Structure 1
Amino acid sequence: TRKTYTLTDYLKNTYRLKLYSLRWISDHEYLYKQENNILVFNAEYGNSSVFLENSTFDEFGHSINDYSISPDGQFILLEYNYVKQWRHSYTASYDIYDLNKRQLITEERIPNNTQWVTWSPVGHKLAYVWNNDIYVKIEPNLPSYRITWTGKEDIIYNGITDWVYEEEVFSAYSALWWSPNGTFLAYAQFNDTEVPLIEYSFYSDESLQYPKTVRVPYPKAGAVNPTVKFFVVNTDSLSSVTNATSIQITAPASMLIGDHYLCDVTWATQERISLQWLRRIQNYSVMDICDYDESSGRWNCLVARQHIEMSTTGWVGRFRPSEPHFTLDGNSFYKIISNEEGYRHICYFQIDKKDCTFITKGTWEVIGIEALTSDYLYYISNEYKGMPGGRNLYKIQLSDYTKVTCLSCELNPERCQYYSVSFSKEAKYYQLRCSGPGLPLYTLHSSVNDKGLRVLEDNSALDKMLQNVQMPSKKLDFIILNETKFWYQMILPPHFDKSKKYPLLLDVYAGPCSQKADTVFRLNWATYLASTENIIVASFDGRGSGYQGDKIMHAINRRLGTFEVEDQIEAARQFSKMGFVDNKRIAIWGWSYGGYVTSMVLGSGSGVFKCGIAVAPVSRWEYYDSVYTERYMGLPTPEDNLDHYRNSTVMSRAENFKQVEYLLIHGTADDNVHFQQSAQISKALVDVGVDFQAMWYTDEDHGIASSTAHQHIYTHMSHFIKQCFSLP
């Protein structure tokens, strides 16, 4: 009898997915780490050489965290002393190694505690941020030029984001943007002066006698937000003037009338930059297109080139307005926007014409634009077989929009229904990454003829291992509610028998634009629960979920904690109707937004669920950050949406928790969903006399991702679920 996929298997990573992470350094070469060596590969022929021997930095005296080659291949940036901050941010030390001299650079070093560093896109200029100010080095061994003098910890951020811009706007710590040939450096400056601080204890190693109070500028919903300014400096003038001027580009009047955000920066050409601004009420966005004026040294944004993007039904964009993709001459661009039917499709704009032309259409959505050449645009969509949870690469002929080729659909249709892609520098080659429903498959292709060049990684090692294991299966299907298809997936135990009644765990996220029903192959906690414990683990994408049009996505507009919650309950009722579910053993669990929905469901009084687990839940929308929360909820004021803010809290349902077994879990150093959120849940449950289970994770953040804590939480949750399901 074949073994099952056990909890220890999951927690110890005994069955490991192989990846193929390459880095394009040109239009036909990529770097690949093999056996701690860095190899350089020729894409056309697949032959390789050693770029950097594994033993090069033995006597470096530090463990190197990451590396970065300069665009001209002359230098490598060595990252060490990595100290993580938030989701994207971190600090590090940096050395520069001269590749042609085979020497480490010892003068005018990038300082310790550097917050961000980036090569120019061409050559080997560097911009870095240190103590919240910007510096540029023209040559790796020469002195830096200071660009800003206003940087102030927790107060003024030049070239880096504050907490909320990092998490909610840019998904990056960096807030600087080199022009395409590196002449100009554009950057944002954030002012957090009147932004309130979240404060929480950090206990650290047991040697620390007094706990530290961590203090982070964090605007909760309705609070004072950071303000923002945008500047461009000419780095080519740095060696010529004592103090090069940062030229400000001001937001349009339609933004300046109130609170607003900078939400996108995209260079079009050497002397043309595009900026998108978003009103604090996030249903109105404005793109400015600004040109360098050689005679005045200023940047001017013609109103004839200004583009409005607004929504009557919800917010703008999936999580933010989409990025433009400019044609080489910078006189036109492509952009994913919601069409008249509410489906996100590629629109083609002339920079000085307000009406765009949709180049794709249908009842499915474009996920992203991946590459653009003079002849073709390449994009990912979920068109294939009308499956919103699939992803495929398509190529559209720019001179004839009726010519649309699916590049990935039919490569291995049984094994591969979810693709991402990685193009070489000028799109001469592409790497396809299939992530399911079979084992991930990595392949290389040439764009000139769309022929497969070779398989890079096929996970045959893992396939061989998994043959000796009773693996679960995955069903992806839909149910029809109110004449609309809503998709679900089930992780089903090995030897699934429809004539039996299985315990069911509903795995929930259900945030706006979420998707939990897809074609991705995963080895996770659900795999163990199905394989070893014979539990069906289900997920459902109801109202508010993404990639299916605005009618579904915007259904929860101004109303979080309503339809997305109800639809999870309804999903569980539908799963019972299917006849293989033990109605006495239905559980629910989720993390983050999923913890909020789980808690809302458990407090609904539905009677459907025996037990559930919320990890790091939101409990009350006024506790969560402004940019995310207000996008869906508006402002917590009597004149806007306070009534629904107050009506959608977990705490107001405390009394209904008498009907369920609840486990509440939160990391004490969660900078994102503050421990406060679960602290208020537990207190409301104490106050009505509801018994529940609890677990805090000392110094863990929103990820609860340290090796020991990750193993501890999943072990704790497994005992809880098994107890609930009367499993030995």
Structure 2
Amino acid sequence: SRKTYTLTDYLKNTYRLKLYSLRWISDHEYLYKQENNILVFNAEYGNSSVFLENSTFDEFGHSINDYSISPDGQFILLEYNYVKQWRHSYTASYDIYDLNKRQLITEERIPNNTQWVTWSPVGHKLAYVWNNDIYVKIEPNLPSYRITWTGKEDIIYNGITDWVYEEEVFSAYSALWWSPNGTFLAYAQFNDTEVPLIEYSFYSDESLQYPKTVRVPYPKAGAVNPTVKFFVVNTDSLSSVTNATSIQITAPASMLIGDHYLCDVTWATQERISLQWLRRIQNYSVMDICDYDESSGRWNCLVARQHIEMSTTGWVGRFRPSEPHFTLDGNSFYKIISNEEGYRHICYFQIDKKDCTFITKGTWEVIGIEALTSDYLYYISNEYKGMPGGRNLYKIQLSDYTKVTCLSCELNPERCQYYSVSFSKEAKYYQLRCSGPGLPLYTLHSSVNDKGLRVLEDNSALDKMLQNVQMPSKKLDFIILNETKFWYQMILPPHFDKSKKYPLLLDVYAGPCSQKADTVFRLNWATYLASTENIIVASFDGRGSGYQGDKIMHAINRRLGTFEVEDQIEAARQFSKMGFVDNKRIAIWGWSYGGYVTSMVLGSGSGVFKCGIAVAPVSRWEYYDSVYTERYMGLPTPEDNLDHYRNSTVMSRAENFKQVEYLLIHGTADDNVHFQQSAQISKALVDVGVDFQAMWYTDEDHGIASSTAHQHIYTHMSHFIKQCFSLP
């Protein structure tokens, strides 16, 4: 008895992980979505009490894809007719429901096919984007006010980011920021007039007689980038003029001088907004702190409040310039910047004082700032046990930085080593999210003493099911190379016999600041591979990886497709050395950046891997977007770094692919890593006459995540691997 974790078990999602999605509406309560009905909870005692139930919205017809309640709690936006676009972007229909009269507002409805809706942070004002133009609703039922008239499809964006700004810059779609109070409405405008369009076919259902051509403004390496502008309009003046004027906030000169980006915008106070800019050469960054001049009605940014942040050994921040966390009065803020020893830590900034004051240690980094009160500052880091693959919640005392307390480390050191967190409105309560190494564990706490209130979810059910199946184990250790340690991860098969020689599959990503070796508990393809197929699925964070200091993260600066690739190969060598690895059966696979590395490795001529699989890989850095690529590669010009752009392609290694079994896969409708990238790979292989396996996924994007598609690829991928290892 006691079966194993089968492929179907994975694909069919038999053994599911329970979550506990919260949503703090106040500082004492939160909303819990239970599919059918959505009730509210009292953090204090844990009172149930339904806020809105299933039937409360029946006889409606359209299935409510999502909700969103106004701050003042009088209205509720109903999101239906949802139509996903990119990662965060999506078009949809909206209806507002009045809770003070249990009536569905029917006048002046929000336009169908609206791109984005935002409640004001206070009250019940609305701001939305339709046809790339911003509109404002002072009252949910009254007609709205047009804010911009320049909106133009694929050309001018107001209130919404373009493709690149959504995925790489703001890692979000919304390009508008309501002032804390709700008086001002700040927004960015993107001009993509000059930006080249990526075009690819989209077949749709058989019913479509003619394929469609999807064309999106997408700037590739060194191409023409969109331009940006920032505006701030006063919504209180809307009911007084007819056409409120949007004040523009320009400069800095050090930015206007050349190609630049808008990377951050966060309000500090009712009349103070901070803005961060970045040159296309992401080695320099400028933060302006602007105040509203009640006299001129203009926004001013004193140079005495301008903070610069440049990097010499690489780029600024992990993926973008750090984020500002202002204190209440808005006269100072906290930011995560690498110290002199190249480690990312928190330091205190005085808006008019240029030098910050670090408040955190050394060898280890702070992952992010979670909450800031008058008392303490809550942050998550990997300081505990010195393991960079772990994550915990610490609390540092603002009046004595020598007083730092870990709030999650000892809650359950065995089962919980990787934490996430969510504080209530004023940080009176917080929910902890343990995701490993044991089964997820959700708990609620009160900030006063950090006393555990109760267990919201312990996945007890799942624990009972998994003890009936031969689950694999996971070793998280490190290996020392060139007098410096690099962590690796290994999903070991049931009853691991260090005497036997197992076949090994190297799971790889290796991108800048990435981390494949951690304490997170997972139920993925690797689980099945080790549990059923008895294959060791190992991952290694070599040079280029992050969370271990710049010295390591910046190793591949201006040099992608090198050390990151080399270390990956060496990890295997180091693994076989351990003696429980069958050298004749060593594979490697990755997705996107992983596909890139997997492919660069398979073409190294090393002779360490027998076969490999590349999914939606990158072939040459000139085919990827500007913001990400240039951040590490610089410019594809002979004056900058063109030389390395051409030396790091996968096509240039085509000839060496004759020594390994290769499997190429990619979705034909991938807006991120274009099908073009794999198209050039196959073509090069055909030119040097190298036989390989190929698989394309009609109309699948980068995720190739559609239910059927997802099941189809892992199934195909599996036959490949079993065949390469001589299984079953």
Q: TM-score, normalised by structure 1?
A: 1.00
- Residue of structure 1 equivalent to 2:170: 170
Residues 35 and 273 of structure 1, relative CA distance in 2, 3 Å threshold: closer
Instruction: Give secondary structure in 1 for the equivalent of 2:710.
Output: helix
Q: CA offset at residue 448 of structure 1?
A: 1.1
- Residue of structure 2 equivalent to 1:154: 154
**Cα deviations across residues 418-455 of structure 1 (Å, max 9, x unaligned)?**
00100000000000000000000000000011100000
Alpha-carbon distance in 1 for matches of 2:203, 2:48: 49
Q: CA offset at residue 53 of structure 1?
A: 1.2
Instruction: Give secondary structure in 1 for the equivalent of 2:437.
Output: coil
**Cα deviations across residues 82-118 of structure 1 (Å, max 9, x unaligned)?**
0000011000000101112111110011110000001
**Cα deviations across residues 569-626 of structure 1 (Å, max 9, x unaligned)?**
0000000000000000000000000000000000000000000000000000001000
Alpha-carbon distance in 2 for matches of 1:611, 1:429: 51
**Cα deviations across residues 116-168 of structure 1 (Å, max 9, x unaligned)?**
00100111111000000000101100110110000000000000000000010
Alpha-carbon distance in 2 for matches of 1:37, 1:88: 25
**Cα deviations across residues 604-660 of structure 1 (Å, max 9, x unaligned)?**
000000000000000000010000000000000000000000000000000000000
Alpha-carbon distance in 2 for matches of 1:282, 1:35: 44
Alpha-carbon distance in 1 for matches of 2:614, 2:209: 32
Alpha-carbon distance in 2 for matches of 1:423, 1:281: 36
Alpha-carbon distance in 1 for matches of 2:605, 2:429: 56
Q: CA offset at residue 56 of structure 1?
A: 1.4
Q: CA offset at residue 57 of structure 1?
A: 1.5
**Cα deviations across residues 62-83 of structure 1 (Å, max 9, x unaligned)?**
0111100101111111101000
Instruction: Give secondary structure in 2 for the equivalent of 1:51.
Output: coil
Alpha-carbon distance in 1 for matches of 2:232, 2:35: 42
Alpha-carbon distance in 1 for matches of 2:192, 2:315: 25
Alpha-carbon distance in 2 for matches of 1:60, 1:448: 44
Q: CA offset at residue 366 of structure 1?
A: 0.4
**Cα deviations across residues 241-300 of structure 1 (Å, max 9, x unaligned)?**
110010000020000110000000010000000000000000100000000000100000
- Residue of structure 1 equivalent to 2:647: 647
Q: CA offset at residue 34 of structure 1?
A: 2.2
- Residue of structure 2 equivalent to 1:437: 437
Alpha-carbon distance in 2 for matches of 1:74, 1:449: 34
Instruction: Give secondary structure in 1 for the equivalent of 2:56.
Output: coil
Worse-superposed segment, 55-64 or 659-668:
55-64
- Residue of structure 1 equivalent to 2:706: 706
Structure 2, unpaired ranges of 5+: none
Question: Displaced runs of 4+ in structure 1, greater than 3 A?
Answer: none
**Cα deviations across residues 380-428 of structure 1 (Å, max 9, x unaligned)?**
0000001111000000110110010000000000000000100000000
Alpha-carbon distance in 1 for matches of 2:486, 2:53: 52
Alpha-carbon distance in 2 for matches of 1:228, 1:35: 40
Alpha-carbon distance in 2 for matches of 1:428, 1:618: 46
Q: CA offset at residue 60 of structure 1?
A: 1.0
Alpha-carbon distance in 2 for matches of 1:447, 1:401: 18
Alpha-carbon distance in 2 for matches of 1:22, 1:222: 42
- Residue of structure 2 equivalent to 1:264: 264
Q: CA offset at residue 561 of structure 1?
A: 0.2
Instruction: Give secondary structure in 2 for the equivalent of 1:230.
Output: strand
Alpha-carbon distance in 2 for matches of 1:656, 1:58: 62
- Residue of structure 1 equivalent to 2:105: 105
Matches for 1:213-362 after TM superposition, within 5 Å: 213-362=213-362
Q: CA offset at residue 51 of structure 1?
A: 0.7
Q: CA offset at residue 199 of structure 1?
A: 0.5
Instruction: Give secondary structure in 2 for the equivalent of 1:574.
Output: helix
Alpha-carbon distance in 2 for matches of 1:682, 1:28: 57
Alpha-carbon distance in 2 for matches of 1:254, 1:190: 20
Alpha-carbon distance in 2 for matches of 1:174, 1:138: 19
Q: CA offset at residue 35 of structure 1?
A: 4.8
Alpha-carbon distance in 2 for matches of 1:640, 1:704: 35
Structure 1, unpaired ranges of 5+: none
Q: CA offset at residue 2 of structure 1?
A: 0.6
**Cα deviations across residues 211-251 of structure 1 (Å, max 9, x unaligned)?**
00000000000000000000000011111111001000002
**Cα deviations across residues 638-688 of structure 1 (Å, max 9, x unaligned)?**
000000000000000000000000000000000110100000000000000
Alpha-carbon distance in 1 for matches of 2:100, 2:483: 66
Alpha-carbon distance in 1 for matches of 2:30, 2:461: 24
Instruction: Give secondary structure in 1 for the equivalent of 2:353.
Output: coil
Q: CA offset at residue 361 of structure 1?
A: 1.9
Alpha-carbon distance in 2 for matches of 1:651, 1:726: 29
Alpha-carbon distance in 1 for matches of 2:52, 2:100: 12
Q: Percent identity?
A: 100
Alpha-carbon distance in 2 for matches of 1:443, 1:53: 25
Alpha-carbon distance in 1 for matches of 2:139, 2:548: 49
